[PDB]
Design a protein around this ligand. Structure first.
Ligand code: MG
Ligand code: MG
Ligand code: MG
Ligand code: MG
Ligand code: MG
Ligand code: MG
Ligand code: MG
Ligand code: MG
Ligand code: MG
Ligand code: MG
Ligand code: MG
Ligand code: MG
Ligand code: MG
Ligand code: MG
Ligand code: MG
Ligand code: MG
Ligand code: MG
Ligand code: MG
Ligand code: MG
Ligand code: MG
Ligand code: MG
Ligand code: MG
Ligand code: ZN
Lengths: 50, 114, 69, 99, 91
RNA sequence: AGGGCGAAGCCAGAGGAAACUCUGGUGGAGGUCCGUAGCGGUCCUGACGUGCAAAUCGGUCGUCCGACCUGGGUAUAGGGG
RNA sequence: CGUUGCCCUCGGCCGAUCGAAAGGGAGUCGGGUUCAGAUCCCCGAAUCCGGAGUGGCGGAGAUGGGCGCCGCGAGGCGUCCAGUGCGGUAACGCGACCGAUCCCGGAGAAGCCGGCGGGAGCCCCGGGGAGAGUUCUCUUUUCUUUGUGAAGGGCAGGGCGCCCUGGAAUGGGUUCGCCCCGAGAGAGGGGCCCGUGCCUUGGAAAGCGUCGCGGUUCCGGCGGCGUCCGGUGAGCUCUCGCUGGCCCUUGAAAAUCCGGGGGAGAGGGUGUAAAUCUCGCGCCGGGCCGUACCCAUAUCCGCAGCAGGUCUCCAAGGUGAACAGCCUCUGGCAUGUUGGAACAAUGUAGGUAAGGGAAGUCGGCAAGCCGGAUCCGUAACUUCGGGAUAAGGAUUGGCUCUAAGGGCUGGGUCGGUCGCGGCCGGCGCCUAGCAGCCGACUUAGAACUGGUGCGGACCAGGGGAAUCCGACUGUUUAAUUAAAACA
């Protein structure tokens, strides 16, 4: 909005940190079932806890 | 023609968001935001509709800054009340007290008579 | 800022503790003398050139006298 | 008053691209005064010749950049507006130069 | 009757509202906009400010009067009675 | 937006014995008219009708100083508002 | 001298608290700078608020007057009082000018609409420059560009329901409109407020425009020149101001800030004090959170880059009544999720049609006619206001002329004397005014002219006679009913 509270800004920050894709060294771990992050949120489609 | 934008996030044209055009040394017309128009104080009499002389009509929280002389005038009831209403108050307050004395005298004569 | 009208007055303002740079703008036909202070930038317009050249010497202890060009 | 405008064409003439006498003649023809082309409006403006330098000397009010116009017109006629450029060297002056 | 024969003040209303109502309004509509005489200075400046309150512009004497007239008749008749009784009581 | 009509008040001139009346101005009233933005939504029973659209589009329309339009805040909650 | 404990002394409130990124609410602006941030970074100019004890400094308070001596005199001492500033007839003024609880007042703090005026921004016109484009012919060309922040100081320019003089009917003054006057008009002199306008400090050093160099480079390099003068206005936008109109409508509170009335107190004793709603300068501080971008025919909501929806600011030239439409510059785009080749039928959206003119159809549905302006001319009926652009007519182009509408400035000339200018005295006294110099724009009339075309596109009423319903304006079924329903 460009007029944020601090509460909201911090919320957004964490959401922004969560988006990154898996580190590829994770795929090489021993008992690995994970191939892709599957919790990736694109701003244009799917619109936050808000 | 150079059109222009507001300089603050207040979009709406309001009492708060009043402006004026100014040419800078950079040679670009720019909005400057303008200070509200202060009023001279009206009289303590309350009948004289005209506002007071010899007072800097300025937004009241400024008065703080101003010197005492700007804020008033050298008279009894100075910068609170218009002269006319003082010199009527004066002679009123005097003439009233002279009659109160006359009634006191007429009372005292009536006591001495009776 | 503040303009000054007496050569003495600018000399007194220049002699304060708070003062510093006393830059000198030869405009042609004018020769200003801008002396910064804490609050204000005092200037003094000295129309004569020889009188400005004389004053140049009269600033005191080793101030900046940062002549302007 | 005395309005004295030079119009020096030093190194187009030295390269031999134009002739200053013909340019003078063209200027004596054209330079209009009060909406009359020929005869310099009588003995009003005066055109001088000094090999390269032209000088125009008026008594009446006379624009400087009217000389720029007429040089530009003359340069077009001679097909020189391509590698010749009029510039104000200084005030009271123009100056033909290359690119 | 320069401009209108018989509407005057209530010509503003045009055709609307009916003849009787517009005739009925003309009486008030006149009186309420009338400038009366300030029985205080004597200038003709008593002008209704809002209902029941008339103000002299010169005198600066605001005066509680009628809704459409500086004086109602009722007020006037009440005034005189009170004055009569006042005199009857005190003697 | 811009136009139209031109209410009270005011001026002059003319008549009138008076009452007052005419003529020319000025003045700018109004849930006044035209008409833009705005708000709306008449008709074409037009377009569209697996649409651009789970109600849209085009022209044509109503209204456009007022029971006007409109943001934000605030109140009223289900046999209740 | 602080700090605290206790004792006395005084003290109404009014409801704790929450409630506005558009209400109220002190104080920041110019230039530069980034791949992306700037009133926030840098440079420079400011500014408010709080603190400032020991008070950092000046200045004000405040340094008179008397008497007595001594000294030629300037003056020196002794001793007595005065001194919480002064000016103006007044409006009110001057840099400061003690002061509590208490009280009164003001500011914050006010609707809409009209008209008129002043100030800017923009547009326009005439010229100066600098760079342009055009140049077959013409064009002293057409195009661009031509600057000064806040805060101070000065001065215009506005306004005054301020004062003093004085006394107005033959009544005057005066507005576009009004409106004012013995409760003081005109006339003269002043006082106050705003001064966003000029000038100036700021500030040319900075910016912009040009020509030019320095540097293979890096480089915010460095120089020249210039940044001028005038005129216009129912012009538009904003604004300040005055003055009306409307209301059975009368159009926010509070925080905060000041003024005044009071006079409880405090100050030192003749060089100083307490005091500065402190004057000028000096010192220190100002934490917390927001600050990217989109803001919409692709960043929002309608399942989507959806013809829908979604609150504002700025707002050039031409034509024109116009923020109408049509064309243009500034700025912006690539035709709205594709291309190519054809040009069949059906369509969707536009047009045109001989003769007739509603014969079509439930029904003139649809389209067509009409349309602007000026000049005439205008019925029935009527609630006398309307009806009314009733109806019905005529004109309209281009060109070349005419007439009619305004401002400014100027005579005190002759004689004398003093420095073209002044001062004095006498004539003159345009008192029917005349002379020179400027500048918008309209209106009417006339000639000529064209293949009768001319509101040439754009914009832009079809009328009439009657009946029914509802007086009217208003409202209504979001998404089949706008009505005669509701009001
Ligand atoms: Mg979305
Ligand atoms: Mg606000
Ligand atoms: Mg004062
Ligand atoms: Mg259909
Ligand atoms: Mg289909
Ligand atoms: Mg599509
Ligand atoms: Mg709160
Ligand atoms: Mg007077
Ligand atoms: Mg931003
Ligand atoms: Mg936009
Ligand atoms: Mg297309
Ligand atoms: Mg394409
Ligand atoms: Mg698209
Ligand atoms: Mg046909
Ligand atoms: Mg048939
Ligand atoms: Mg038939
Ligand atoms: Mg039809
Ligand atoms: Mg009819
Ligand atoms: Mg019947
Ligand atoms: Mg109805
Ligand atoms: Mg419906
Ligand atoms: Mg419908
Ligand atoms: Zn008073």
């Amino acid at each position: 909005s460009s007029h944020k509270t601090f509460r909201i800004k911090r919320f957004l920050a964490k959401k922004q940190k969560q988006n990154r894709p898996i580190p590829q060294w994770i795929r090489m771990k021993t008992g690995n079932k994970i191939r892709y992050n599957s919790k990736r949120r694109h701003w244009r489609r799917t619109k936050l806890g808000l | 023609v150079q059109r222009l934008t507001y300089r603050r996030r207040l979009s709406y044209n309001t009492a708060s968001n009043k402006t004026r055009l100014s040419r800078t040394p950079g040679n670009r017309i720019v909005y400057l935001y303008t200070k509200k128009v202060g009023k001279a104080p009206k009289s303590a009499c309350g009948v004289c509709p005209g506002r007071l002389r010899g007072v800097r009509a300025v937004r009241p929280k400024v008065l703080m800054r101003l010197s005492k002389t700007k804020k008033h005038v050298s008279r009894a009831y100075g910068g609170s009340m218009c002269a006319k209403c003082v010199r009527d108050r004066i002679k009123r307050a005097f003439l009233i007290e002279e009659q109160k004395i006359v009634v006191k005298v007429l009372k005292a004569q009536a006591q001495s008579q009776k | 800022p503040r303009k000054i009208e007496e050569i003495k007055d600018f000399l007194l303002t220049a002699r304060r503790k708070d003062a510093k740079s006393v830059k000198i703008k030869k405009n042609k036909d004018n020769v200003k003398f801008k002396v910064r202070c804490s609050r204000y930038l005092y200037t003094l317009v000295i129309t004569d050139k020889e009188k400005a050249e004389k004053l140049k010497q009269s600033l005191p202890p080793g101030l900046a006298v940062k002549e302007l060009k | 008053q005395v309005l004295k405008f030079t119009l020096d064409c030093t190194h187009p003439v030295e390269d031999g691209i134009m002739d200053a006498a013909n340019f003078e003649q063209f200027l004596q023809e054209r330079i209009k005064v009060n909406g009359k082309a020929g005869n310099l409006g009588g003995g009003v403006v005066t055109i001088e010749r000094s090999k390269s330098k032209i000088t125009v000397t008026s008594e009446v009010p006379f624009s400087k950049r009217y000389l720029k116009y007429l040089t530009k017109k003359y340069l077009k006629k001679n097909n020189l507006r391509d590698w010749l450029r009029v510039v104000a060297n200084s005030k009271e002056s123009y100056e033909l130069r290359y690119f | 009757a320069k401009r209108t024969k018989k509407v005057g003040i209530v010509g503003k209303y045009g055709t609307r509202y009916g003849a009787s109502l517009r005739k009925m309004v003309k009486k008030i509509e006149i009186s309420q906009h009338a400038k009366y005489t300030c029985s205080f200075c004597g200038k003709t400046k008593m002008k209704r400010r809002a209902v029941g309150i008339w103000h002299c512009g010169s005198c600066m004497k605001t005066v509680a009067g009628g809704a459409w007239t500086y004086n109602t008749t009722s007020a006037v008749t009440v005034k005189s009675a009170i004055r009569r009784l006042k005199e009857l009581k005190d003697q």
